[PDB]
Amino acid sequence: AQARKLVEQLKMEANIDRIKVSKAAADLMAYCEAHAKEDPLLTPVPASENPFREK
Amino acid sequence: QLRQEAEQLKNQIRDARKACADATLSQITNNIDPVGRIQMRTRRTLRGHLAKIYAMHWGTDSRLLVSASQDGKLIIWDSYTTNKVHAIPLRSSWVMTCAYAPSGNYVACGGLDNICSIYNLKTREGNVRVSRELAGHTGYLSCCRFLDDNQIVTSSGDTTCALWDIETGQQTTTFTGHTGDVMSLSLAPDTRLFVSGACDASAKLWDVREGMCRQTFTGHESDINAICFFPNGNAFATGSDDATCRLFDLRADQELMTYSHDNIICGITSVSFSKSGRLLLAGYDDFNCNVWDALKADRAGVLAGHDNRVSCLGVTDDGMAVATGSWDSFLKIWN
Amino acid sequence: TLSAEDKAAVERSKMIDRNLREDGEKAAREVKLLLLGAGESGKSTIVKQMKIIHEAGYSEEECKQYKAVVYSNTIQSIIAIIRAMGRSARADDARQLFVLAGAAEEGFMTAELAGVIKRLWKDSGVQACFNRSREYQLNDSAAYYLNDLDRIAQPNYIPTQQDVLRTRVKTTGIVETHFTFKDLHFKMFDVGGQRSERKKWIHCFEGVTAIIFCVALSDYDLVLAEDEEMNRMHESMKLFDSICNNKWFTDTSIILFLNKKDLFEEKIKKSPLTICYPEYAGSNTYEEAAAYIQCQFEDLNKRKDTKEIYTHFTCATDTKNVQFVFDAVTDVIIKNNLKDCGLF
Amino acid sequence: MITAITIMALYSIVCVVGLFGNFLVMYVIVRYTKMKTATNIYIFNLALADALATSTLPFQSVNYLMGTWPFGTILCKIVISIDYYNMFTSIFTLCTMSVDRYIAVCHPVKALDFRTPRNAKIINVCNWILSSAIGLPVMFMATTKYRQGSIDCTLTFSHPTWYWENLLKICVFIFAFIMPVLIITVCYGLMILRLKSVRMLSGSKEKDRNLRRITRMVLVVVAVFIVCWTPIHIYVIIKALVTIPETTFQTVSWHFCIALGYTNSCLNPVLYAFLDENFKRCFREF
Numbered sequence A: 001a002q003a004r005k006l007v008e009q010l011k012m013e014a015n016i017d018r019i020k021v022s023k024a025a026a027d028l029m030a031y032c033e034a035h036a037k038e039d040p041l042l043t044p045v046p047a048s049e050n051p052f053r054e055k
Numbered sequence B: 001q002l003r004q005e006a007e008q009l010k011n012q013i014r015d016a017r018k019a020c021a022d023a024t025l026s027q028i029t030n031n032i033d034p035v036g037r038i039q040m041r042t043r044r045t046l047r048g049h050l051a052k053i054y055a056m057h058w059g060t061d062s063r064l065l066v067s068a069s070q071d072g073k074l075i076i077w078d079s080y081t082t083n084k085v086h087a088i089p090l091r092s093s094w095v096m097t098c099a100y101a102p103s104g105n106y107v108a109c110g111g112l113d114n115i116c117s118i119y120n121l122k123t124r125e126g127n128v129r130v131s132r133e134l135a136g137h138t139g140y141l142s143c144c145r146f147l148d149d150n151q152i153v154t155s156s157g158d159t160t161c162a163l164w165d166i167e168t169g170q171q172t173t174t175f176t177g178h179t180g181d182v183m184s185l186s187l188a189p190d191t192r193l194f195v196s197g198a199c200d201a202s203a204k205l206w207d208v209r210e211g212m213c214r215q216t217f218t219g220h221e222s223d224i225n226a227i228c229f230f231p232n233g234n235a236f237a238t239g240s241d242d243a244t245c246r247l248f249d250l251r252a253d254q255e256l257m258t259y260s261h262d263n264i265i266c267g268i269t270s271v272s273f274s275k276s277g278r279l280l281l282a283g284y285d286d287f288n289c290n291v292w293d294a295l296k297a298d299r300a301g302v303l304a305g306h307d308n309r310v311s312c313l314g315v316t317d318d319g320m321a322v323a324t325g326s327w328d329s330f331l332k333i334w335n
Numbered sequence C: 001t002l003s004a005e006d007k008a009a010v011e012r013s014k015m016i017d018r019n020l021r022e023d024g025e026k027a028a029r030e031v032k033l034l035l036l037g038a039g040e041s042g043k044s045t046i047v048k049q050m051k052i053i054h055e056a057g058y059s060e061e062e063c064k065q066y067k068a069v070v071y072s073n074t075i076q077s078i079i080a081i082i083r084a085m086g087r088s089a090r091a092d093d094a095r096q097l098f099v100l101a102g103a104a105e106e107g108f109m110t111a112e113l114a115g116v117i118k119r120l121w122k123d124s125g126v127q128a129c130f131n132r133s134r135e136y137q138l139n140d141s142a143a144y145y146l147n148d149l150d151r152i153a154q155p156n157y158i159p160t161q162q163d164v165l166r167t168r169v170k171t172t173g174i175v176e177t178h179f180t181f182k183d184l185h186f187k188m189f190d191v192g193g194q195r196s197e198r199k200k201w202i203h204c205f206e207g208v209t210a211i212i213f214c215v216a217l218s219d220y221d222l223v224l225a226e227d228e229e230m231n232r233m234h235e236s237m238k239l240f241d242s243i244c245n246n247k248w249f250t251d252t253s254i255i256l257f258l259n260k261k262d263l264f265e266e267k268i269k270k271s272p273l274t275i276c277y278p279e280y281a282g283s284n285t286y287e288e289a290a291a292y293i294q295c296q297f298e299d300l301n302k303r304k305d306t307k308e309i310y311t312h313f314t315c316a317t318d319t320k321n322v323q324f325v326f327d328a329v330t331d332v333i334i335k336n337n338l339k340d341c342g343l344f
Numbered sequence D: 001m002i003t004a005i006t007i008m009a010l011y012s013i014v015c016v017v018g019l020f021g022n023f024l025v026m027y028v029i030v031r032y033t034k035m036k037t038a039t040n041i042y043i044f045n046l047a048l049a050d051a052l053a054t055s056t057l058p059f060q061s062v063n064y065l066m067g068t069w070p071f072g073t074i075l076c077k078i079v080i081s082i083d084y085y086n087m088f089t090s091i092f093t094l095c096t097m098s099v100d101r102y103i104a105v106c107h108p109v110k111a112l113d114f115r116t117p118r119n120a121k122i123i124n125v126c127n128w129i130l131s132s133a134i135g136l137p138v139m140f141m142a143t144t145k146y147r148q149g150s151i152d153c154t155l156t157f158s159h160p161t162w163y164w165e166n167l168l169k170i171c172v173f174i175f176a177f178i179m180p181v182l183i184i185t186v187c188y189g190l191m192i193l194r195l196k197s198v199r200m201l202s203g204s205k206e207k208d209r210n211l212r213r214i215t216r217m218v219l220v221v222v223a224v225f226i227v228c229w230t231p232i233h234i235y236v237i238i239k240a241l242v243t244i245p246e247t248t249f250q251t252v253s254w255h256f257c258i259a260l261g262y263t264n265s266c267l268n269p270v271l272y273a274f275l276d277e278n279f280k281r282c283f284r285e286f
């Protein structure tokens, strides 16, 4: 009962489409340097617009 | 019998994965400039807990977060002015999960009481009440996430995930298939998928709609303690106990990048991503968070200042903050 | 420069700070006991012989929370019975749709609750519909709420303490028992429900005052039903070994309760004592056998210079069992106060 | 000839060692360890009392060296006032620290809800207030007099000089000698008996070593306090009882009694903070 449903679950996980590692890593990197000028952690934003300042 | 059939077609699956690999992520990012060394300072220390913090979730308004500890208190903080907006007295002190709704109207918690409590933050009386308690699980509730105002997905100790409906209290969908205790789940940015990891050192992606596992990822060997989707939803990162964070993948279904070092042999409790996705922040058991480069697999900086083990972590939605809660009743927001 | 909004925010946060202050100072006076035990070791008897208070605590805060739970359960039950009606009685159906819309629009309690407790009891087919609804799984106390809620209609109704019990979901896992004994408060936890992996919630305690590890004495010659190859006292010993040699429990005191005493006295006379311990054959009496069991169970403390074990033999009534718990706890409190005073 | 030189040198060394020890204790208790536990508040206030008690020592040393008081009237008004203040603050914080340990041992259930930091704060506030409530009746009467062409500012009393003077003498004697020795011995003796009866310190070599170390470091506390405060009180009471001929021997004995009291004030941080195991834990981490 459990073994047959495990077999069919893992065999329907078998037949799915896969793109190459190069394409997925490439567009992950492309997403990385498409928002790089927006992320405040990578490039520290000026303290004038920073809402976390000493009072 | 059919055990050999399962073994040989699993052999077919990871043979297809091996044939699908032609270049690692190291070689495709071997020419980009690194982030170098980044320095982050604690602008806000959120004192007010008196016990061991275990969970933290930010808010969509990027200003209010919530954290839970072992004193039976669920404190909604303020990142801007350091103000305790709410502090709910919990009916179960043993909790290690807390969630914050995308609308900001609801907050969740759960733990060894097998109950996913939901609290209404904007009742007509002005205080915080209890709306619905989600019963049906037989194990400790490790991570819950709010899909919307109506649905919430939970990971339990009974090796099954569950999708709930708030006004009925019934699991509309059950996500079975884990041969081990699921400890963390992360919702997709498009709220159509979610991926969870378990003690069997495997991660599984599920469809919220049709309720069946699509992919499995067996990169880790110890367990899975944390998991977090990429901002675009095409990858995720996994924390574990063998001193390794692994960046898995969806459309290619392998282990892309290994974030491990030979001096940080402690475990990992928490992972999060920034807005750009280039900065994977991971909490560790050696009392400090490590900041990793999600493309170069090297440490950029260390978030010290916690004298006890870091337990929970989260990057805010607009990327301007990183809150780390740890086992010393304090939270720390960094820039 | 901050005005009324920030001033009110600061005042509210100060109030939260004070509330956390008294709550933490109250929780510091408690004593946390972690009650362990193997299969049918006798934890239920230990719990039930300390029957003083179990539902006592934050009674005012309890009754002011689950009102939304009550309203949501009532609206779920009425929409469930409306849906189970399908798949001369239309005016009340329109009334039920109206109270459905009112509950979707909150509406508090002034108008909708009076209508929903008035119109439901006028008809006679409601009981038949509820009986037909039992084919599928529904709320276990829907009609119970219906016939024990219509008697009161106050905006802040406090009928009984039983309402808090019936609305709150019973905890399958961690179990809380809070009793007091000689001006000191005890909070005992039963972890019998949690049966997945203890390695990921034993650290969730990490600092309880004492452990109440219970062992049945008469399981020395008994064997488990799981493959019929494991002795029950041997797995009790291995659980005690895992608890004693634990990184989270390295200095806490363990109070071993050897519970099945009269059954042990019955078993010694007809059964040999060499089944559990083949290397031991000293006597056949109750005293030496029980003492040898206790001695072979206390040497599992691999760090005897810091951790203390207080072993007691309890059988049936034993008012002095709680006294033994209190003595061990006050010894632990003395050690903690000496640690706090820079003496120990 | 050289008696003044050696007593000035001994005053100087006891003053600098006391000030350095109390400053180290204050530095550690502010920077390295915090002030959250009640005993930390107690040792902080003891450190302040000892540091402010020994800060008047250069004034008295140069008063003896120059044979006169060239510091005016208000300066020694506050010096004698702060000396009477500081002896009572240090003595009373020793008394309340011993009471604290006795409560933590013999009454554990009550010490759960009594040994809170705010309770220690209000006890210490009442301590310095009650020391001030008898140091301020000295503030309004100490003054500078002239005798034999030299300046001295011993405190001067009303028209019944002997009655008020001896009332002050017997009151400070009974309070700051009979009150601490009785309280300290009864509290520490009951604590040591209860530790002898308790399980965790008996029945093993390590446990008996721990119990013997606790008894040793309590008995050395009582012994150092009694020995260092014991010659000055009875010497003052026999100077007040019978007249004494003026000799070099009585001057050197008086100065050695003063030095022994200030040596207690100097050695309190050594046997009260450095011998605490929490401070040892803080020290071994760096």
Ligand SMILES: CC(C)CCC[C@@H](C)[C@H]1CC[C@H]2[C@@H]3CC=C4C[C@@H](O)CC[C@]4(C)[C@H]3CC[C@]12C
Pocket (backbone or CB within 6 Å): D041, D044, D045, D048, D121, D124, D125, D128
């Ligand atoms: C300088 C001299 C002459 C004046 C008298 C000083 C008195 C008023 C001072 C000296 C030491 C002080 C205490 C030192 C430390 C603390 C801890 C703090 O968290 C609350 C106040 C409290 C308890 C202080 C109260 C006031 C105090 C007793």
Ligand SMILES: CC(C)CCC[C@@H](C)[C@H]1CC[C@H]2[C@@H]3CC=C4C[C@@H](O)CC[C@]4(C)[C@H]3CC[C@]12C
Pocket (backbone or CB within 6 Å): D227, D230, D231, D234, D235, D244, D247, D249, D250, D253, D254, D257
């Ligand atoms: C209680 C024990 C431990 C110590 C007692 C010490 C005191 C009481 C002793 C020690 C040295 C003593 C002094 C030594 C010498 C002299 C000179 C003599 O012409 C008059 C008495 C006088 C001034 C003594 C007074 C009492 C004295 C101060």
Ligand SMILES: Nc1nc2c(ncn2[C@@H]2O[C@H](COP(=O)(O)OP(O)(O)=S)[C@@H](O)[C@H]2O)c(=O)[nH]1
Pocket (backbone or CB within 6 Å): C037, C038, C039, C040, C041, C042, C043, C044, C045, C192, C259, C260, C261, C262, C263, C315, C316
């Ligand atoms: N004759 C006799 N019976 C005893 C004695 N003490 C306990 N029991 C029974 O032992 C079972 C343990 O069940 P329990 O619920 O604790 O199991 P658990 O580990 O899952 S919580 C209970 O039914 C008790 O009547 C005793 O002295 N004499």
Ligand SMILES: C=CCN1CC[C@]23c4c5ccc(O)c4O[C@H]2C(=O)CC[C@@]3(O)[C@H]1C5
Pocket (backbone or CB within 6 Å): D083, D084, D087, D169, D172, D173, D232, D233, D236, D257, D258, D259, D260, D261, D262
């Ligand atoms: C060791 C120094 C403490 N001092 C406190 C005040 C005083 C003193 C001591 C003991 C008993 C007293 O009555 C008394 O008053 C004072 C006095 O007469 C000169 C000696 C002292 O400065 C000294 C010790």
